[model samples]
Target chain A: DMKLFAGNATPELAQRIANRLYTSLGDAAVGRFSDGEVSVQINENVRGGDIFIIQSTCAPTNDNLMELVVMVDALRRASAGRITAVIPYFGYARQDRRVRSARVPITAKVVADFLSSVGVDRVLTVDLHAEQIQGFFDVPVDNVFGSPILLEDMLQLNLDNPIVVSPDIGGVVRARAIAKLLNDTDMAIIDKRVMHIIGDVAGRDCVLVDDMIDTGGTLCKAAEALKERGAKRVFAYATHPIFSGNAANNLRNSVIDEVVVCDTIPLSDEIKSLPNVRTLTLSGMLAEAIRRISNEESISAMFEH
Target chain B: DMKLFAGNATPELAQRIANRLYTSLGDAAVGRFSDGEVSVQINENVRGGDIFIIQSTCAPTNDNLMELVVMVDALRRASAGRITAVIPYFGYARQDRRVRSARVPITAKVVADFLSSVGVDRVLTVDLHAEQIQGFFDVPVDNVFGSPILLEDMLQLNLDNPIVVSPDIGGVVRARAIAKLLNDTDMAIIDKRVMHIIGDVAGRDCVLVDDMIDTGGTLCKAAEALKERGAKRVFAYATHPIFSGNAANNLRNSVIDEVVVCDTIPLSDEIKSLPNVRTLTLSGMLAEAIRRISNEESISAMFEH
Candidate 1:
């Protein structure tokens, strides 16, 4: 892509990619008017050039989504050859499938439809809740994985007898993926028996893995179980760092060494100060994928393990 | 109008009411099963009784909303006489109107439709962005104000030369309403003419009045302005305490003497420890309102100036 735009969601991650590629964000005022209205004004000329607008639909999800949608419409109207929405955190992806419900709306499908309706030519997102959410989009969708980048950093964080820990049984797949990537590291599962006590992973450096961390109770409980089992250190690695409500504090208080989270959502200064929390940059991966998609490169390889 | 049921967005908030009422939470588990499915099991016996569910659709808005909707639907299927959704902080209230181009959905209308669709008989919320959103609901909506309860606490503070400050020019109406009630004190406006410096109350105990506190930027900016103006002490009184992000630290660092926020969002221990941040309880006020609603009493008189 000749032109690329990023949002406030992952400012640091976005900035790193822009620095790495020696490219600045395309000119645009992606903000709202005083009356709480969203306004997208493209100041850059993108005629016949591929444009990629990078925005993570993270916290304040609706606002971010609106910004992305309006920016896409603006780029499409400005005669861009291809417009791609690079979302590090594709929200509402959790509601991909309802286990049991009557008349419940499929929020993921709704989001997909909304993006398509806003004239998005393609989508570039990392670690969707369910891979099927990709099918929800009619346009070309490139779902990127964070394991490569996470593994790169995980290899450096020296630990003795490290064992990957899934916060819950559901996240076993992701945890296993990460464990398998970590030079044949041992893997453990924390079965949810109740609110607090779960299976133990003691006497080993624990690496908790999940798609997102919202309330963080699951992770905290996992950390406790791992600690009780005599685990020396604990770390959390996830594609999306949702860190919602007292989550940072919970992680800090828990018996964990460090939380290796991706810069899907912008990190607050306080979160950065927490000694145990580290963020891996996914911007390079996302940006490269965006570039590939805009230039008609193979996207399937992006998701390959 | 005999049966009364309660719904809370969080069990913690619900537990508060349950403790206050000297009764147990009555067999309610808004949890997911092993398959990660939301399962709401209302174990309390409420056959043909009016039910009031108190939930703040704040952060994790969709999950909270889904819980409320599913709870109400469960009550409806259980043949409850009526289901009243008592929301402390109603999310998506800010999207009442389209302030900019291409605001696809009026969120307020959509939320109202969602509530009505879930077979909720009425909605009881505090401090909506606009009163008109109530009209969006086909069912009855009682827009309660936490101002009166918060005003009671402000009076006890015994501030000297206290001037009520509206953080933004548009919020003067809300400030004036509280000001008029509080011995008709002179009100000050935080001129947001400049993007940053908004506060302007000095040489007095400035009391910033607002419906809610979000991110605490406007409050921090106003407090800073008032301090620069030589205000002796700065206080804030807000209805819904939707403190998001690092707002607690910001409030602690700001020149605010004390922030008197209501117990709408269920303060945690960490939140309660914020410097100069004290909370006023609204259980009595909300409980009375719920009782009146169940009794089919006139609630408009309670809102009268």
Candidate 2:
């Protein structure tokens, strides 16, 4: 009663998820016509079987998202029992509300609306920009937190007097949770007021946390401030690596020594070339979630202690 | 009042259409987030105006088509009087039927459904692959023929006793219409057997006609057959120059001396570099149609002699 497939979104990660679930991805031709429209032909029959479509609406976002929607429609039309869009990095999760004028659109809602409109039964994604974004979808959405995975990876680092730091006040709650999990280590927030590392960090290893990295400006700048305030070599842990414009260059010149992020989005050769960039795979956790969802088991159980 | 705007789909052709209507494309931001999701924001007020979203569903077909749909939605939500999807090369026009199984989706209909679902008022396009595709949409559709424009350019060649030839029996009706227009010139269809030019081509200037050229296979093969049949210097004329995969090299190495096509789809530098490849513009005709549609005038009058 379970099957797996993927669109052109991120087949590499999709394959990894399939492998972790002890199954190969179902036969589906997510191709393009000569004209460049996404052509999805689900090769096998699902006829009432649970189906998970792994598609990350990452770079080439519009095409990838549309590809996922088209694939979902295809499988649904083929009479699949249920369809879940496994979007590792939910694209457009930022514009969750009227953060600006009514003149501005909540595109995040539009994306959610599209998936729901196209008859997607459920959505499984990682590190949503805002928890409220989940309510945008009419269908059930399991917004998995990657903090435990990031924390697990951080444990391997085994740093000296490590203190979790949030780039801004908004993320302190998140940092405080991570601090408690890191054997109840202290936490700090980067306040705009001078030197901005809220807690003492003199001669301590600082671990910066965020849901994603876009410009790397905040993280890189935060790392620099920590260094200036008598911190040892800094490290960063996050989900969804968005090394947008000047990031590789900024990370190239930054004070943080090593930057680690989960592979919610695939790393391009540009990111791979950077010496400080390290990737952790979310395939295992994602595969487990898919299995639990397919079996209708409690999703929160896997993440619980 | 009229306003024109475009997505990332064929901005070149969009500009030409706008220029022909004697106005520039409106100030609209069709930006994409770093995540690659298209972000369309109409920068000016378009309230109660007939808005034309000029987009060609060309290469990168899914993105282009979605962008067109998204733009239409944006303008509609902004209280535009009417929204017309001005797609020069309709992306899924060829898939006008369930050519194969119940499993094979009529993507042309899906595109039409999406347009209607998004509240598009009208659709304007050129050389739709089939007439039935127009019926797929609930909205009014103007399927403009590119033949008249292609025919006008064909007249300038002034070949000796011009005879229009069809690549196959399917295009015989198309070739006959073209023949009748060319001062009642003789018409021939390419039957698949034994140097099959249905009508004699001895010393006649053969003009191979089709709606489009893809892979340059049928047209290139037809041109060769015309050459074999004692036809004087073969010429090829068509719309939608889809020089897909080895077509440039095939056309480069074909007996077809002059390949004249209309600029419905933009010619990439790959197609541009071919010496025999000549281009004719449909901007004026497309402009006229846009104006006629805007004014509620008869669209047929412009084509009548």
Candidate 3:
């Protein structure tokens, strides 16, 4: 039987994932030693059990990683039959290359190598900043796109004359992919080069899309551009709702009908109160992938549209 | 012999660091391959040579990190005696812990593990979001503070009753550190409970101090607060001038007299054109530390006040 362990990163997401699987995360306590070093103790027995650790490496990323690493180490030491790492928000995946003055470090490859070194048998994540980051790992990586979940939510919103929009030219691919999933909606690309100049997007329901919205500038500009282009209304969506640093205000005043994002990164209460933004969940998708991995099922077919 | 390499992240800073060490980043074709892959070829002989590669993992973080990793892997395959990874702006270090739900995979430790596994001898970075990220590494880490460079710059700027202001309570430590560098300048914390409210900052020269300035909301709001407090002048200093998105407009319109930040990350032409923003170089300090490390000298004393 497969036994799942959820670290402190996302207890709620873990419980939800477990609920989807008709299982529970079980009792677990992760604490710091007296000297302030991390120590994780699994409160339940899992001898000869298939194991999956559900954790999201978000803020306080190092401590969370340490907790997960220690938990995995403990599971390995305890002879768990199989160990899989299910990370909802792969943090360092953005640092796959060093583009600066000196040779720094490649964080994606580093994280991948770390998981492999820690004896993680498989890696599972969603909407990585760069799909190529998955190639950095030697082990099998199950990369899930949250577009299906996002589309499921968008379809219920009852938009009119919808035209999918990639916030920037680079994001056109993702926008097109989502468009393909959304009743084959017509598409438009935001010309980021023409900042503050609203393009002609008249008579269309604008659906701006990207991977994440850090300060929401890209989304705001995209929405403004669509509005300028005569778009009747504008809506925005992203996989990771990393609603960082005053992004709430930017999203509030933006010229969009509404904004939608996934709960991949747990949002603070302040972000939840934004009048124009809505959030959806990918716990079902993540849970399904985890279940498939635990059952040793084909994970690639999960990406099929 | 010790040889050094520099990427395009901060060319000016790298040049300054190279000059300080009485050397130059030798002829190396550090460019992109036809496939857009980072192509780094050390033209000069580095066989059995101690090599230090300087790069910042910043915008286009994946590309830059890949350049560093591919370079390191190439250097290791090319018989470099010892390799040191020098990163001025260690990107994704902020996600040091999981602050939100379903977040795991602290990118910092993952990067540390990557460099360790990929044949890095040591790691050097400056003003990490958290100092504890050093503990995540198996390799030796030298975490340098950018205060010295900022402190030296502070000597040039004349201000009467310059009270350092921590924009938020969380940044008091940073303001205190800068205040310490400024002869223990009197400091006040901007007790901002709301994002845009300016409360309780009266009768002070309000010099806001922080690590990085992304959207400039906090800085702008703090400046407004300080101005409302009957402050004669307002100035600010941040280590990293990310100035991303609409930060230029936000900072330009804020009540701040000027904002100073280190050259840890490259400033784009658009950001450079901002009226009241200036930059200081951390190369002098970084170069000194790099030299000490290359010569097998101590770095602890160098970072000490």
Candidate 4:
């Protein structure tokens, strides 16, 4: 009933999402000219069929974003019944507000405008760094959570007296959700400088939750701080593994026992080869959401359990 | 009062525009971090002043576009009286339609949305490849023509029996404008392949007109075709000299006698070294437009000869 397409950013991830839905990835040639101009061609007829284009606006953000936009435009012109952009990791999500300096752009809003203006009927994304980014879009947005997938993996760990910790105050909501999922486990917050912990973690195995880890500096520092405060074992969970600038090396040597991340942003071999890294796939969750959206079913029902 | 600023994309152009208006460029520190993220800080008090940020989304298109967007956001947050984005060579202008292939995005519209969503009150641009791109913005867009500048320079050529030539059918409107400015000189259109000429160029000097010259392949080929049709001389004029991918070398050895380009996009040393190339400055045109915009005067009057 629907056609799926993958951009160059994360072909493997798109393939997995399509496979989960028991459909083939749509036929499309997404390429670039020698002059660095993006070229796109939809090979098959998509008229009257709902289309979903999967592209993660991750690293090399501009090219990936352009590809997705062009693909959506193509689908619209081809008379596709409906089009939804499945952006696993929405890049530029960090710049959602004018927080620090004057005259700075909220790129998150700009990106949202780009998608909506390019004729996307709806947006499907996971774990946006700023939840309020959903409001930026004029069209409906299905912001599926990575928590259920992450929690399922965490529950299998079965650590004694586990305490959930937010790497910083900004991530307290995400950590609180995980804590609530764990039958209301005790939660702690780390100060901005990572020098202070807000709650008790003495002798308990600690779990840190955040939306993303970019340079891995804050996660490593937080793990070190938690261990210093008498936490027995420290584990970190983040939806996006940006793994930028020696992030793998930092995670490999840091005090964190295991770093659990989702496959929202594809992991490079360098990151996957790291000894302390564990990955959870969001394909099943995203596929289910897509199915529910196409069938006019409630997406929130998946998170209730 | 007006406060003008420039990102790294076109500091010299910004300087020229400011100097033409007899005002100094505003103080602003715009740079990038090691991770390639745009960093901007306004060093002066822009509160209550009309702010103009000059940048061309030319080469390194994404970075410059982001810089301009971020700067607009910065000015808005600083409570500037008015914020105008002065984009001389608006990048992604060619993607104005979903043609040739189904499901391709009109990226020009996407760029328009990016600017409007990021708090830009108005847009000032020159010679958009597609004039209709102006309607893409919800905000007012002052699409100034490069015709007057190109016409002024062409008048000085003093060629005997000059004929305006559109390199392709798509550019007939631009070329016809030049022909009209030249006291209604004859105009010719080239077929898509550039192998055939539609009108008489026999024994007449030809002026090829286009909005931009990217690789120089099409322009060079068009010139060769005109010469084969017994044109006495051939010259090329484009607003943006995006002399990319061996464009300089190609222009130097091509059949064209001379190439005239405007300073909308900066020229590198290699491009400047081309013997057959001549450059024209757009500072006067943009400065006049900016003055009129701030004074609430008529912009169209500048084009009326």
> On a 0 to 1 DockQ scale, where is model 4?
0.35
lDDT of 2: 0.81
Question: In candidate 2, which residue pairs clash?
Answer: A36-B61, A37-B61
- Model 4, native contacts kept: 0.43
TM-score for candidate 1:
0.53
Interface RMSD for all numbered candidates: 8.4, 2.8, 11.7, 2.7
**Chain A TM-score vs. truth, each candidate:** 0.90, 0.95, 0.91, 0.95
Give iRMSD, candidate 1. Answer: 8.4
Q: Write the per-residue lDDT of candidate 3 for residues B1-305, one digit (tens) a residue.
A: 98988877767788888899999886667775322345566667778998998988876565566567767876776778999989988865764234332312344665676677778999898888655688888888888888777767776777776678788877778778787878787767777455433334456566787877877888888778768758888888889877666887887777888889998888888888887888888888888888899888888888665
TM-score of each: 0.53, 0.91, 0.56, 0.85
**Which 10-residue window of candidate 2 chain A scores lowest in summed lDDT?**
A95-104
DockQ of the two-chain complex in candidate 2: 0.34
lDDT of 4 by residue, B8-127 (tens): 888898899899999999888887643345667887899999989899988777777778877887778788999989999888776423436544656676678777867889989998
lDDT for A131 in candidate 1 is 54
Each model's RMSD to truth, in Å?
10.9, 3.0, 14.6, 3.8
For model 3, the stretches where C-alpha displacement exceeds 4 angstroms are A33-36, A95-104, A129-131, A195-200, A298-305, B3-80, B84-116, B121-305
Query: Per-residue error at B266 for model 2, in Å?
Result: 2.1
Candidate 1 or 4, higher lDDT? 4
